[PDB]
Design a protein around this nucleic acid. Sequence first.
DNA 1: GCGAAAAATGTGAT
DNA 2: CTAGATCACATTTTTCG
DNA 3: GCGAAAAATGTGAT
DNA 4: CTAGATCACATTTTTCG
Lengths: 201, 197
Amino acid sequence: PTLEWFLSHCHIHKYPSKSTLIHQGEKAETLYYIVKGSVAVLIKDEEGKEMILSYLNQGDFIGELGLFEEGQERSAWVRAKTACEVAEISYKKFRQLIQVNPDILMRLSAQMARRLQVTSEKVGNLAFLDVTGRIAQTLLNLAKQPDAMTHPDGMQIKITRQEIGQIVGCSRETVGRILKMLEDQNLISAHGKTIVVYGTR
Amino acid sequence: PTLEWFLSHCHIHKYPSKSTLIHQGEKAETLYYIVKGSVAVLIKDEEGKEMILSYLNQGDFIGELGLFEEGQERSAWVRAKTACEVAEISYKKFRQLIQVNPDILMRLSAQMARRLQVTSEKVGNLAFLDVTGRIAQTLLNLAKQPDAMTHPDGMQIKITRQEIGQIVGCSRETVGRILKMLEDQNLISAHGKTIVV
DNA sequence: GCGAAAAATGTGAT
DNA sequence: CTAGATCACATTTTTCG
DNA sequence: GCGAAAAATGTGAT
DNA sequence: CTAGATCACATTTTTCG
Ligand SMILES: Nc1ncnc2c1ncn2[C@@H]1O[C@@H]2COP(=O)(O)O[C@H]2[C@H]1O
Ligand SMILES: Nc1ncnc2c1ncn2[C@@H]1O[C@@H]2COP(=O)(O)O[C@H]2[C@H]1O
């Protein structure tokens, strides 16, 4: 399949858990593709707080927002979540490749298009909702996220309050008090391993 | 170049001051092109409010997200800040134009990455800044803009308080109560006009 | 599948 | 314990015929 | 090159 | 008016050699 033409030119490498895959600011060097495992992508403010903006899992393409112009600094931080294998090709060679088969360039644009639907939703969520709203919404998202392991009354996830405050944009104390709130209503069962129960699965 | 070959196949239309060229929610088929004019992409909440998620101008492709996922919704709302001239091609045709001269595709994919980029910044200005912070860089970015006039020494953009309010995500009454404060803290001077120094 | 050490947490007036 | 929202309604600024 | 209506605004506790 | 951040350390639970 078309993928294998790229995945052959693209050098697979092992990256351990927590291993800072890409750093913000550097200069657009390679094009990356996750052949096993997962990744987190985050930015930080005036200086200090990091905020997650997306994860990405098997089959995505990291760092492609340079590719179409020259001299772009890295957009943001990309830090491995679980250990993963991120294969890669040099920008210059990607282009030459695009012409010998452009239906992978097609496949890239797909991700570069959907990621902005998701991201424009985010602006939505941080402008129109309040933290309880964002949290509730996010838990549903994460249930959808491939990470989840089923539990006989809803999708299970083992994430942490610190991280929710980080995706949600709020101090982890408020995560503590709201996750408690949605528990004393039966929307949530929660001990480190959280299960947001919506019935159906 | 690749541009004039591409365009030709596009029914060209002249939408007037504040038309609605894409209603959010509806069906996707048209990949538009502003051959002249300017757009304001919005998102709206079922209850009253909206957020100016982007300005788009001449040269920009529009309604591009449908194209790879067959069967979809029109992500947001495109309105019209001035009389424009927009071109149009059926997606399934555009897809054929891809597979004969693949340069036009790049030009959209590049239109995207720059967007993906500026929007991810928007995300952050919301999770990290004061209203003052926000209004402030909004008065800066609004000067890196095709429609702003190089006033005596600096940029003179016109844009109203409710307008800045929609971009920022803050109330109108705060916006005014605040930007005129960036005047004592001599960063701007205004009067309908916002003569960012 | 350990248990020492490393990380996450939560509670309240302002 | 601080930032920014929410009240109507005249005064004020802007809109082209 | 000028006059109505029309958009937009400011404020002030809380 | 009202929502959440927040300071600081006991205590609880999750990571890793
Ligand atoms: N909003 C976003 N959503 C998803 N991925 C993003 C977003 N912003 C940046 N990225 C990714 O993060 C990478 C960091 O810089 P690159 O230009 O290498 O490529 C970027 C994209 O792969
Ligand atoms: N983040 C964004 N920045 C700029 N324009 C956008 C953004 N999100 C959506 N749009 C544009 O608005 C269009 C709405 O309909 P489409 O999804 O067809 O395609 C969308 C884009 O062209």
